Design a binder for this molecule. Structure first.
Ligand code: NAG
Length: 361
């Protein structure tokens, strides 16, 4: 099994214990750590944070302890956005400048591969993405001739049917990618007006839950479209999503006025780290969605959909039963990386629960 784990470069800045640098990562926890995100500047791959050269080195030092560990650099992300990626990929000359830039940058900085995180290609982009992936892979092939182990190529792909059909020729891109991380944790958000879970494994039968907005549906679709199981990695979140409730109702379909209040550490409305959520559960009422197989919790006017040790193990058992390549984790700096929040003196509780299932059998 692969266990693909993202480390975000902006986590460093969080206050107090929310601060996460790459030396916090257990070298043996994941098979592959992906550093998020790289820029494109002058049509070439580039650093993002002022100190990314230092933190790339911190990350790459982890291989001293675990020489089998692989690292990738993820280019794109949401601040980068779509339109910038579109401009690069749709023209022969900028595409080539970018693709040429990648192997030398990665080798300089100690990375084993590239992760493409274009969030997200429009309908006019689907064919360019195909070309980009094929051509990037071919440049990696060529570059292996010089005697170092071929660079890995991966891609982060959204899990909604609509975004998949719009942007991605899955049958073609799966031929050239070494794995595809399926983003099976954005099925609900504050744009909806009611509470709901963003990472359910199956449909909720009570709600008239659009048949597609669940991990199983997404995995089955990707397979149906031609992604080989042995390339497909299923995403599992260590964050949860929060909502502010519009009434005393807490139940399936309960109305919301907006995203939840920001976390003490993550300081972003609508999202909490798992460490934050362990704190939130003190004095919260907990519930599980039985059909969807994922928990939520509530306290005052706040309502939080999240994943716990039991739900992440459950998702790991599912992906193994479907003979998937493994799991992806968004993100290491959102699990209880310190180990001190969740009453168990155990660093990376969610990620290690996933790991221990994937090792079992
Ligand atoms: C990324 O590259 C763009 C385009 O060159 C540049 O304008 C921007 O400052 C860069 N972003 C960061 C954060 O480095």
């Amino acid at each position: 099994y692969k266990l693909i784990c993202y480390y975000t470069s902006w986590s460093q800045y969080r206050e107090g214990d929310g601060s996460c640098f790459p030396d916090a990562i257990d070298p043996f926890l994941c098979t592959h750590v992906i550093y998020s995100f790289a820029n494109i500047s002058n049509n070439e791959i580039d650093t993002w944070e002022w100190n990314d050269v230092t933190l790339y080195d911190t990350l790459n030092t982890l291989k001293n302890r675990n020489p089998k560990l692989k690292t990738l650099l993820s280019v794109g992300g949401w601040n980068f956005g779509s339109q910038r990626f579109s401009k690069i990929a749709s023209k022969t000359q900028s595409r080539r400048t970018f693709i040429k830039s990648v192997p030398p940058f990665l080798r300089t900085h100690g990375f084993d591969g590239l992760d493409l995180a274009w969030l997200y290609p429009g309908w006019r982009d689907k064919r360019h993405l195909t070309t980009l992936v094929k051509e990037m892979k071919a440049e990696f092939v060529r570059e292996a001739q010089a005697g170092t182990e071929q660079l890995l190529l991966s891609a982060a792909v959204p899990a909604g049917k609509i975004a998949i059909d719009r942007g991605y020729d899955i049958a073609q891109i799966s031929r050239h990618l070494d794995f595809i991380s399926l983003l099976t944790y954005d099925f609900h958000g504050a744009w909806r007006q009611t509470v709901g879970h963003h990472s359910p494994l199956f449909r909720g039968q009570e709600d008239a839950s659009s048949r597609f907005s669940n991990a199983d549906y997404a995995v089955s679709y990707m397979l149906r479209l031609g992604a080989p199981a042995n390339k497909l990695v299923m995403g599992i979140p260590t964050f949860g999503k929060s909502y502010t409730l519009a009434s005393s109702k807490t139940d399936v379909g309960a109305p919301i006025s907006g995203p939840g209040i920001p976390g003490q550490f993550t300081k972003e409305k609508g999202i909490l780290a798992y460490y934050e959520i362990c704190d939130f559960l003190h004095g919260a009422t907990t519930h599980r969605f039985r059909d969807q197989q994922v928990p939520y919790a509530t306290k005052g006017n706040q309502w939080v959909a999240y994943d716990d040790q039991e739900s992440v193990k459950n998702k790991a058992r599912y992906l193994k039963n479907r003979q998937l390549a493994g799991a992806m984790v968004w993100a290491l700096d959102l699990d209880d990386f310190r180990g001190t929040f969740c009453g168990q003196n155990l660093a990376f509780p969610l990620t290690n629960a996933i790991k221990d299932v994937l090792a079992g059998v």
